[PDB]
Design a protein around this ligand. Structure first.
Ligand SMILES: [Zn+2]
Lengths: 167, 167, 167
């Protein structure tokens, strides 16, 4: 049998894992919230300085938080309402400072003014993320996904958007 | 270095926080379930006796669980199917008896009979809640949100609602 | 006071409950992922050997993982895009090896080819599950639900599904 000190040490480490998992869920919650509400400075804080991830089906690859936030902002203008809704996460602590997470995303885009007015886009994806921990704080390091489906369509003009945090 | 007793005491407190967080998520799960299934008496149990929150753009303010439940019920009759779907929470334990939580809501309303038959309403919101703990039980104390968007529209009559817990 | 050894033993048990809850959430995450992505062999691993659950309004009852997976597969062919999206769980550890969970499901079916092309089905449900633990691993034992609503409808042909993991 193990000593008390040994059992406490075990509890310390096991609890740290549970704490790290909550922190990662909280991280990803912030990420979506800041993205869909276009608080770009805040969003930048969720990203590792060592970040490397890609977009436009691998056509574009970015190497810092600045670079990524700048880019997302370009694809998410005022005219575009975004909802990126995360579900049923599967988080795994790979080491004391690294982790992997799967997420299930429903997404929804609605254009209100500008050149793509009334265009609607809906879909789903299985994201897989990598995270890393730096000075006691978790950060997103890599994000990749598999598309479940994507549908593009013209919305009915007779639909009235009665409230909008962006207009 | 800390003593064993001190390290245990730390674990006791740190684990209590993790327990409180789960309890709050469970609370909010019950809240949505009871709201969307119109079990009003059950819903009343999720609310602090000391509750204070507001509605109709701050025009209406309620001061007890009775008062609030009564009100929600008035805005959620049999004729109205509601789905209030919670995502990616960010919970913070502010003290041993208080907490703050952010939630990401997609919402969906469908009217089946009555004066607004075939009306559909969809939206999203970033809720921010305050919770408090009373005799070992968590309760909702304040709820507020920012609307992402709200769309009102007429549904196609050729859609058949084949099942409905309320009719 | 309780002794140190007693306080440690308490922490061991209380933390195990929190660990079990995370495992159950992860389990259900896998279940949805494998179902919607039609990885049937993987899905079979989420199910207790002692599983017993029913379908077609109680008309059909299955007694093993093989039997169930076989069945779901029959109702979920390539032609049918499925999204079963889980929300706001309420998990309760009933014993060291059994548990109960409530889940809030939004669901969405879209048929792309075959005899039901362009048919769309949307709905919601309050699932209630039973889980059991076998050789350190959690498994789904029973699944049942209450339908919130179900809507069937013909989709507009002018909608382009631009991406699809199944085609
Ligand atoms: Zn959702």
């Amino acid at each position: 049998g193990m000593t008390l000190e040994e059992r406490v040490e075990a509890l310390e480490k096991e609890l740290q894992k549970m704490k790290d998992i909550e922190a990662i869920k909280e991280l990803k919650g912030k990420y979506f919230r800041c993205l869909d509400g276009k608080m770009w400075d805040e969003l930048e804080t969720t990203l590792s300085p060592n970040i490397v991830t890609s977009y436009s089906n691998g056509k574009l690859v970015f190497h810092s938080p600045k670079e990524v936030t700048d880019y997302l902002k370009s694809t998410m203008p005022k005219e575009e309402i975004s909802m990126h809704m995360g579900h049923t996460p599967e988080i795994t602590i790979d080491s004391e400072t690294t982790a992997t997470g799967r997420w299930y995303l429903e997404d929804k885009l609605i254009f209100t003014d500008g050149k793509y007015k009334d265009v609607g886009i809906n879909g789903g994806a299985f994201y897989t993320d990598k995270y890393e921990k730096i000075e006691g704080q978790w950060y997103i390091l890599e994000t990749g996904y598999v598309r479940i489906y994507e549908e593009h369509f013209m919305r009915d003009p007779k639909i009235h958007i009665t409230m909008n945090m962006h207009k």
